[PDB]
Write a protein that binds this ligand. Structure first.
Ligand code: A1BOB
Ligand code: ZN
Length: 139
């Protein structure tokens, strides 16, 4: 679990969105596993606007942060689950690192701010849904 709070927005994994998230829907993209809902309170996370390929992510299954090198956002094949059929997930970045299903929502950050959130994993690889292109999150 985990979310990004920037301005009047809450960014979560689309497969983990709540009833409240859907009742206050701003935008969602099944192909990205992202959903953004509105909030009454003001958020202070800073979104990175960069092409960083190194950063640190929070791994709840280990109660630890890990430094990683990650790939640029791309279309990557993702196995079927109770949430989605087998498909290509877009805007996804991979790194060599530990992750388990309850790890989705963990933040990946570089020196510039929030890069994205944990969205996939398995086989010693963790996948992060990028948020750096969503420029509207700041306005
Ligand atoms: C096995 C594992 C390890 N770390 C994080 C997550 C996981 C599970 C996993 O990859 N997915 C299940 C939930 C939906 C995901 C998606 N974006 O389609 C895919
Ligand atoms: Zn950066």
């Amino acid at each position: 679990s985990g979310a990004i709070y920037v301005g009047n927005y809450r960014v979560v994994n689309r497969h983990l969105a709540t009833h409240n998230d859907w009742a206050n829907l701003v935008w969602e993209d099944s192909s990205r596993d992202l959903l953004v809902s509105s909030t009454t309170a003001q958020g202070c996370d800073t979104i990175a606007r960069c092409d960083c390929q190194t950063g640190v992510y929070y791994c709840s299954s280990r109660r630890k942060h890990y430094p990683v090198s990650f790939s640029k956002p791309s279309l990557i094949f993702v196995e079927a689950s109770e949430y989605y059929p087998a498909r290509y997930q877009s805007h996804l970045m991979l790194a060599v690192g530990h992750s388990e299903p309850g790890d989705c929502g963990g933040i990946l950050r570089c020196q510039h701010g929030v890069v994205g959130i944990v969205s996939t994993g398995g086989n010693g690889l963790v996948g992060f849904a990028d948020v750096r292109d969503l420029l509207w999150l700041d306005e």
